[PDB]
Amino acid sequence: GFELKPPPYPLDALEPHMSRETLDYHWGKHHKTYVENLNKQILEEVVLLSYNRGNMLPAFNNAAQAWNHEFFWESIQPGGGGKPSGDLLRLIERDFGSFSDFVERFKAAAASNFGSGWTWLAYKANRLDVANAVNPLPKEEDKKLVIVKTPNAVNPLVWDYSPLLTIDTWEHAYYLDFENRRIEYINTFMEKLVSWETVSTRLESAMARAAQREQ
């Protein structure tokens, strides 16, 4: 029986990037409804089992939405924005050339997501459920950071990916504040709410997962 936890930041701390009404409604009547529905039917294991390699089980929707919502809250902090540093900076430079290139690609992907869905930045540590899916000569570049857009409750982990940062392109995430002005919401999110520290920790966790799968 899963439980819904409140965001680790005060509901009034995200102003004006995300209004208190928007925060409370989104957290306590979207995420709460998803979590309680999933509990009624019954997190990574649950999502992977409910994906069922394409023919999603009825419980896939609620569990995946709850996992994505939990991911979204952990990626935003009031003092967010700016630029990352360190191995995350070197990886973003290798995988996008420059920080501006990455930021414009991410903004374009978030704006171009038609309908309800999410935009993800993930670490490519995937393995397929087929034989002859192993590269005997890895070049250390195949495990890179990529941008993926998914509709509804789909998350990259079903492709054995490692999510690092997400932006909720669902209209319910920003219609109360930014209405249909998705460009303004994406710009505000990128420049004020992106928690580079959490992204760095998730990148290190993906590195550790890849290392533990190496041996």
Partner 1 sequence: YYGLKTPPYPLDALEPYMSQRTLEVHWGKHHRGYVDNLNKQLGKDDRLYGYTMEELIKATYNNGNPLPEFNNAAQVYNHDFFWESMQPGGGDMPIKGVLEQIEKDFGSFTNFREKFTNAALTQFGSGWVWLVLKREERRLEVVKTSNAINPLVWDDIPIINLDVWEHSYYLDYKNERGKYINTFLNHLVSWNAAMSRMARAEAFVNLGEPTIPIA
Partner 2 sequence: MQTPLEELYNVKVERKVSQRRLEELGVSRWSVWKTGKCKLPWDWQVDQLVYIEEGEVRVVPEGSKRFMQFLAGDLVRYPKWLEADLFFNAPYSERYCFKAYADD
Partner 3 sequence: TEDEARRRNWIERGWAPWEEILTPEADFARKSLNEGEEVPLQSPEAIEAFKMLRPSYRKKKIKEMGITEDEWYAKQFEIRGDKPPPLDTSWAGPLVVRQIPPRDWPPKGWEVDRKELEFIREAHKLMAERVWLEDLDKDLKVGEDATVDKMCLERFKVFLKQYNEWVEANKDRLEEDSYKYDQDFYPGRRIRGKDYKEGMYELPFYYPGMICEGTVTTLHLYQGAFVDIGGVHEGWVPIKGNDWFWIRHFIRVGMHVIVEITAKRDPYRFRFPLELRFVHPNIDHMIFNKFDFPPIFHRDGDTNPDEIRRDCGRPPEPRKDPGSKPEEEGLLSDHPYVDKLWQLHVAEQMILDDYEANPPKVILKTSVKELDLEAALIERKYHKLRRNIEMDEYDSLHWRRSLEEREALLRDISSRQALGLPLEEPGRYKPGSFFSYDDA
Instruction: State which residue, 153 or 193, has the beta carbon closest to partner 3.
Output: 153
Rounded to 5 degrees, φ, ψ at 127 are -135, 135
**Site membership for partner 1, residue 61 (CB under 8 A):** yes
In the bound complex, what is the minimum distance in angstroms from residue 187's beta carbon to partner 2?
Answer: 20
Using DSSP, state whether 156 is helix, strand or coil.
helix
Q: At what angle do helices 32-41 and 60-74 cross, to 10 degrees?
A: 140
Task: Tell me how many helices (H) and strands (E) the chain has.
Answer: 8, 3
Q: How far is the CB of 210 from partner 3 (least distance, A)?
A: 16
Please, which residue, 14 or 153, has the CB nearer to partner 3? 153
> Residue 171 CB, nearest distance to partner 1 (Å)?
4
> Which listed residue (98, 112, 180, 205) binds partner 2 by CB under 8 A?
112
User: What is the torsion angle, in degrees rounded to the nearest 10, for the CA atoms of residue 21, residue 175, residue 44 and residue 165?
Assistant: -100
Residues in the chain: 215
Residues 8-27 that bind partner 1 (CB under 8 A): 25
* Chain residues that interact with partner 2, rule: CB under 8 A: 112-114, 149, 151
